[PDB]
């Protein structure tokens, strides 16, 4: 059972370079606009404890080299939306998809199409761990990538990358520039906070499991909501909610196994492990499927 990135190739089309005297890093163009992690105007030293306005007003449209490919643009306007910059540029980028910006939550999904200096490299399916960090394959150059989920024709760009915090793990904002998390575009000492594992989504990928014919796992067993949950903190488990139920209701229906079942089998796991065995081939719990991430690969 796989880990499934979206198709890329919408979100290729609007990947572009973006240098700003030496610094340069991915951006993302759609329309007549240009977005980019506003440290872009940063040195190496302007990262240590950057004054962003003061910063940005040494810097003109012509100080900012976008290019696509070969196509260079010319930047007629600049502006600073919290972390992000908008490079108003002549040219609307005719391989501009239908698209949304959106936020999106702690635990849900999205792709990563991964640029370094402008050109894709890779594409990988990610979650956005409850702490609003995200584990993953950042390299020097990969600032401005954006993560995204595709509906149908509709890009929703959810995400853009800014930062390795000095723990290994990353950073970034929405594409309106306000960080997920209480992180700052600023290289010091940050933390992340104690991190979770996403409850509802290692239910979803045991019905997942039962899906595909791993059911080992099931437990004459059962369970209180409260119970569970009293299982759940002592674990680092996110709580889980009747909203959380809700969603996992297509599941429950499609193997006709009841939440809470679900969830006793989930606590025996918790307090006894996996003994060696596994489940859909991994030795510990995936809490990187949402319940639409199981539904969509299991239609
Ligand atoms: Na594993």
Not at 2 to 12: C, D, I, L, Q, Y
Not at 46 to 52: E, S
Not at 145 to 169: A, K, Q, R, W
Not at 256 to 285: F, H, P, W, Y
Request: charged share 15%; hydrophobic share 35%; proline share 4%.
């Amino acid at each position: 059972f796989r880990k499934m990135a979206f198709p890329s190739g919408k979100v290729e089309g609007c990947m572009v370079q973006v240098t700003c005297g030496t610094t340069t890093l991915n951006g993302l163009w759609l329309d007549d606009v240009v977005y980019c992690p506003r440290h872009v105007i940063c040195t190496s030293e302007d990262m240590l404890n950057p004054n962003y306005e003061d910063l940005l007003i040494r810097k003109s449209n012509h100080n900012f080299l976008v290019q696509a490919g070969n196509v260079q643009l010319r930047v007629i306007g600049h502006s600073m939306q919290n972390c992000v910059l908008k490079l108003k540029v002549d040219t609307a980028n005719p391989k501009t998809p239908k698209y949304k910006f959106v936020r999106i939550q702690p635990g849900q999904t999205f792709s990563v199409l991964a640029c370094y200096n402008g050109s894709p490299s890779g594409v990988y399916q990610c979650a956005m761990r409850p702490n609003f960090t995200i584990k993953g394959s950042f390299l020097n150059g990969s600032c401005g990538s954006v993560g995204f989920n595709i509906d149908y024709d509709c890009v929703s760009f959810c995400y853009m990358h800014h930062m390795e915090l000095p723990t290994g793990v990353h950073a970034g904002t929405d594409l309106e520039g306000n960080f997920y998390g209480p992180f700052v575009d600023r290289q010091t000492a940050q933390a992340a906070g104690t991190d979770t594992t996403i409850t509802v989504n290692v239910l979803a990928w045991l019905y997942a499991a039962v899906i595909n014919g791993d059911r080992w796992f099931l437990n004459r067993f059962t369970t209180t909501l409260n119970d569970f949950n009293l299982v759940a903190m002592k674990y680092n488990y996110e709580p889980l909610t009747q909203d959380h139920v809700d969603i996992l209701g297509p599941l429950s229906a499609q193997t006709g196994i009841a939440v809470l079942d679900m969830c006793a089998s989930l606590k025996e796991l918790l307090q006894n492990g996996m003994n060696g065995r596994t489940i859909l081939g991994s030795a510990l719990l995936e809490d990187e499927f949402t319940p639409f991430d199981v539904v969509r690969q299991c239609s």
